[PDB]
Amino acid sequence: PTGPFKREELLDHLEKQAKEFKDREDLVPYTGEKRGKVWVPKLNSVIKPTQYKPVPDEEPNSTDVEETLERIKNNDPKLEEVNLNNIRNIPIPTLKAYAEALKENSYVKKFSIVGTRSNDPVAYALAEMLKENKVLKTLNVESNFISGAGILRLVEALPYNTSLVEMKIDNQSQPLGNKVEMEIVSMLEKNATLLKFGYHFTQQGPRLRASNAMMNNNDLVRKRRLADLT
Amino acid sequence: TTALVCDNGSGLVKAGFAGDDAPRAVFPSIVGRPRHQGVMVGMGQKDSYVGDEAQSKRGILTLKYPIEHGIITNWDDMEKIWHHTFYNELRVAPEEHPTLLTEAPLNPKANREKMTQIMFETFNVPAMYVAIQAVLSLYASGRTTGIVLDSGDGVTHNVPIYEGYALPHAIMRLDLAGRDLTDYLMKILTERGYSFVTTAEREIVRDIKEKLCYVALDFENEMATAASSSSLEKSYELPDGQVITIGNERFRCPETLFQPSFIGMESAGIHETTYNSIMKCDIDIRKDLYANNVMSGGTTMYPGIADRMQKEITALAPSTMKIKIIAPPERKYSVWIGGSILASLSTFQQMWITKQEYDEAGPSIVHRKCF
Amino acid sequence: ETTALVCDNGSGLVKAGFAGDDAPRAVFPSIVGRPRHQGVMVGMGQKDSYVGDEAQSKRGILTLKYPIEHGIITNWDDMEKIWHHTFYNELRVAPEEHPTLLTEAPLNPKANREKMTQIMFETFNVPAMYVAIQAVLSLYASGRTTGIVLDSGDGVTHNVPIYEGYALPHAIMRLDLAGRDLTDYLMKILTERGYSFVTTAEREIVRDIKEKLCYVALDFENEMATAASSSSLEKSYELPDGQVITIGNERFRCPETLFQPSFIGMESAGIHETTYNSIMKCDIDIRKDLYANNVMSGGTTMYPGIADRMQKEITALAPSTMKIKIIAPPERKYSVWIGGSILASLSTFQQMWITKQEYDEAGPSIVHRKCF
Amino acid sequence: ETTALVCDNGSGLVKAGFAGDDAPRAVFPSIVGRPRHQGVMVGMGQKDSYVGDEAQSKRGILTLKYPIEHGIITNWDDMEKIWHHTFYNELRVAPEEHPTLLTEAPLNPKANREKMTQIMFETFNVPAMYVAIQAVLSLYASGRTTGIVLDSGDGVTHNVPIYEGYALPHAIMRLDLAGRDLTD
Ligand SMILES: Nc1ncnc2c1ncn2[C@@H]1O[C@H](COP(=O)(O)OP(=O)(O)O)[C@@H](O)[C@H]1O
Ligand SMILES: Nc1ncnc2c1ncn2[C@@H]1O[C@H](COP(=O)(O)OP(=O)(O)O)[C@@H](O)[C@H]1O
Ligand SMILES: Nc1ncnc2c1ncn2[C@@H]1O[C@H](COP(=O)(O)OP(=O)(O)O)[C@@H](O)[C@H]1O
Ligand SMILES: [Mg+2]
Ligand SMILES: [Mg+2]
Ligand SMILES: [Mg+2]
């Protein structure tokens, strides 16, 4: 329209505008005058906290995203643990590529993507991956920006999966919603394999349904440990 | 005998006459004092400025906000705002007119007492009353039951109300409102290459906010549309004739209300605080709360905010619920409008605290009257 | 030869140590901290959490969650993190060669006890474990057999009366009002003086203010009038960033919610009324013995005005021909743990453990037939 | 008109109506509700107390008290409120021209019956009133003369045996365990 923004012209105009508005002289001055009736009725020490024992920091996650993705694509036998926690600026197609590559990988048993700003496409892709992959044991998607729809799709993948034992989904940026929570526990009652589900429920109903489902699955573990004892 | 209605907010004073359909005076809440660019505070020259004058000579005036997050904290500067409101904006003699004031949710007892003391002892008004903002909004809406979302320039509250009895334990306050949204819009315009960091430019930024921003129904879809095409962009003509183009800033800016991490602040969004407020209220009355979500205040004026709120509450609540969001077009001054309906009633005459009642009872009467 | 472990997992704090001692070895807050969603600090290459003191030290970039709400374990993975931290990081011990004693509040879900047994036997596998009621341990630490225990912690406040070793479960009372509610009320009422504490890192600051400066008034209205008259009850507190705040009546308005729950909108009665109602629901011939043996336990009972106030209120409610005695020892914050150390040291208790063979044979349901 | 009134004030419900009918006209819960929160909206037909169905409908902001506990009237002002409601608001009748029949559980205190008589004759003044045992009425409705009645309501559970119209008071049994205890 008018080309590149000329900030100096705007500032000059604004200052010109300000110069031309002088104040008015119709102000009744504030003197603090009381015109109504005044009503008449008829060792210190600053304890500072010091519980913060400064346990040291760690070392930033040195994983090479490209190299690791290449190893997962190559089905590298030496690669069992993939930890992509707290790595800055991982593209959404890169995470989707990770999820696509993990479908046929025979060797990665733990996968986590905490605090990588992952959203619903990533969760959808991971959901698709979980229907096919038969080796992955641990999935941690905590502390991201995945909505209720992504989580729903994830748990809708669970009856086509018999290998995952831990799903951590807690501390998403938005509450999942009561309706979604109901469909989630409903799906949890239709899988006998998952042993830990990381999520702070809001409603006591699904909370207890989930608790009973997990106790049931662990008791199936107990009973098969008892039956195989000759 | 005509009553006055003064609604003092964090950003704007709205003041006028009971019975009118809109406030006659609307002006910012900024006390402006001489700076030290040259010499000290000159004696005899006007030692303070309010509203428009303080928003004009801004460059040489330290601006203050006497009310901070809806609570009166500088009583001298409050009394100043009030004096200027009576004498220099409405142009009335206060002793001839009953004056209705508003207060924030969960305003401390001592503030109500001090407000009462100032109204009777300084300005010698014949009568006064103090009504709770959110309650006035629900009154104006025509209902006796609902949860108010009141969001202005400085503070947002959720106030659940059932059959005339508000619920103090369930009120939620979020310190995120219009001024934060202006700051965020300024930041992302600076990011795009429009560096509006002067106090002069601030007005322009506020105008862009009030005219071109909207709440997206599905944010990430909108972001993809804005990245994939120019179909959501708008031109804006600046006061000097320059024309700028803005894109996803239109809907990134009010998204902060739903996602406060955009400005750092780790609080829940207004949909989550709304839900949490409802969940602190007893199981029985909850259903009614869901059916009467009333939006009040200027920061609820963004197009599309009702549909987005409807979606988030719908997905956050049990499916069986009837969810309804009520967003009157006149909600920007609805509090004032509520006051206008309030004083105009034939039944309101005996509700005022009179001067004689104050002179007999003292500060006490404000709580010991209509609570 | 194998030393027994005593672990008390309350709503707010974990007190863990070895049996036969006098004080717990590890006392740490029961919180799990997770990364903030603000992308300020991404460089910290951790796993996915911080637990305990480490979470509290780094709280400026963390979101803090309590795994237990109102005495009920709501998240079990975070509970596993707490137990792993208190076994391997704090006590510096290997769990497979030490029996474990755990505690539970009365009128809790059965599933909580079952899953505690299941987690202790299948993930942190112990030779034996035993679950006990907290008020029985408090009475064990008090040295007597008959009494009514008011145990108030971070999530629950429960009254349990016991006469000659027999408990009366129909007179057990439970009130969901404890230290965290008082912390929230203090956060709400500090906004009256212009101080704004909102974030979970500032909640710990408010908790410290409550632990250091609050007390229970003997008469509420007289102390309010005294505070309104003169500034003799006002104390100053220094914030971590060097700011100094002054508080007056908020010192005693905060614990007064324990006697007037309607300050936070609850319809229930105060702790004195609840204690009197628990006494009146028992048999007539044991009430006298309950009157002389009011036993206070828990960290919420540590305010320096609460015994005299409770005695005054209960003496007002009870008949005038009765001796009302409040028993408030100085070490009552860790009475449950002390009782657990007493219980785990008895020679007559060693046949009441639940071995791994019994758990394998019976499953996670023997905890009702073996533990009270 | 002189058409007698029949009112049954149990621990949980009030069943009131006119004699000669088949079903009670007004069946409403025996509760009194009082507000516990702070009122902010003036007027709007706010009451300082609520009785019956109105208290049950608005129970989310009220504290509900039962005037009768285990068949014994513990609060008398609330009982006067219940009787005023069931005379003037529900049955829509004037009490001074209708005899009243009231019910009482066995083995109750005498003071309860005395104060019921005093209130019915000095505040809602009736030409006549009569107090009857509930189990005798239950046997009356069953159509027979001999039987043992187990009457269990909201506060009491009592057994009364009657043979050929003669009652045996030494075999009347009373247990303070009923619906409210099961609710608790
Ligand atoms: N059309 C609009 N779009 C977006 N924001 C608006 C619009 N109109 C007003 N606002 C914002 O609302 C604020 C006015 O709210 P106000 O009525 O003063 O609330 P209160 O006084 O209760 O705080 C202004 O500061 C402005 O930033
Ligand atoms: N000196 C004190 N004064 C008042 N309250 C205290 C004090 N010390 C601790 N507390 C409170 O006690 C609570 C926990 O006490 P305790 O019962 O030992 O832990 P838990 O509830 O986890 O079993 C904390 O929430 C804390 O606020
Ligand atoms: N269908 C039902 N099943 C079980 N209990 C019921 C049923 N209907 C009513 N009740 C119980 O009956 C009690 C009151 O019964 P009733 O004897 O008619 O009233 P009252 O005890 O006041 O005379 C109530 O406490 C209620 O819990
Ligand atoms: Mg306003
Ligand atoms: Mg405890
Ligand atoms: Mg009956």
UniProtKB/Swiss-Prot annotation, chain A:
Signal peptide: none
GO molecular function: actin binding; tropomyosin binding
GO terms (BP aspect): actin filament organization; adult locomotory behavior; lens fiber cell development; muscle contraction; myofibril assembly; pointed-end actin filament capping
Tissue specificity comment: Highly expressed in the erythrocyte, heart and skeletal muscle.
CC annotations in GO: actin filament; cortical cytoskeleton; cytoskeleton; cytosol; membrane; myofibril; sarcomere; striated muscle thin filament
Keywords linked to the UniProt accession: Actin-binding, Cytoplasm, Cytoskeleton
Main location: cytoplasm
Superkingdom as given in the UniProt entry: Eukaryota
Subunit record text: Binds to the N-terminus of tropomyosin and to actin. Interacts with FLII.
UniProt function note: Blocks the elongation and depolymerization of the actin filaments at the pointed end. The Tmod/TM complex contributes to the formation of the short actin protofilament, which in turn defines the geometry of the membrane skeleton. May play an important role in regulating the organization of actin filaments by preferentially binding to a specific tropomyosin isoform at its N-terminus.
Family under the similarity heading: Belongs to the tropomodulin family.
Protein name from the UniProt record: Tropomodulin-1
Name of the coding gene: TMOD1
Span within the parent record: 58 to 348 of 359
Swiss-Prot record, chain D:
Span within the parent record: 6 to 189 of 377
N6-malonyllysine modifications at: K58
Protein name according to UniProt: Actin, alpha skeletal muscle
Positions bearing Tele-methylhistidine: H70
Organism of derivation: Oryctolagus cuniculus (Rabbit)
Function: Actins are highly conserved proteins that are involved in various types of cell motility and are ubiquitously expressed in all eukaryotic cells.
PTM comment: Oxidation of Met-41 and Met-44 by MICALs (MICAL1, MICAL2 or MICAL3) to form methionine sulfoxide promotes actin filament depolymerization. MICAL1 and MICAL2 produce the (R)-S-oxide form. The (R)-S-oxide form is reverted by MSRB1 and MSRB2, which promotes actin repolymerization. Can be mono-ADP-ribosylated on Arg-174 by SpvB of Salmonella spp. This modification blocks subsequent polymerization and leads to cell death.
Something else known: In vertebrates 3 main groups of actin isoforms, alpha, beta and gamma have been identified. The alpha actins are found in muscle tissues and are a major constituent of the contractile apparatus. The beta and gamma actins coexist in most cell types as components of the cytoskeleton and as mediators of internal cell motility.
Subcellular localization(s) per the UniProt record: Cytoplasm, Cytoskeleton
Modified residues (Methionine (R)-sulfoxide): M41, M44
Family recorded in the similarity comment: Belongs to the actin family.
PTM annotation (ADP-ribosylarginine): residues: R174
Subunit: Polymerization of globular actin (G-actin) leads to a structural filament (F-actin) in the form of a two-stranded helix. Each actin can bind to 4 others. Interacts with alpha-actinin. Identified in a complex composed of ACTA1, COBL, GSN and TMSB4X. Interacts with TTID. Interacts (via its C-terminus) with USP25.
Chain positions covered by the region annotation Interaction with alpha-actinin: 107-120
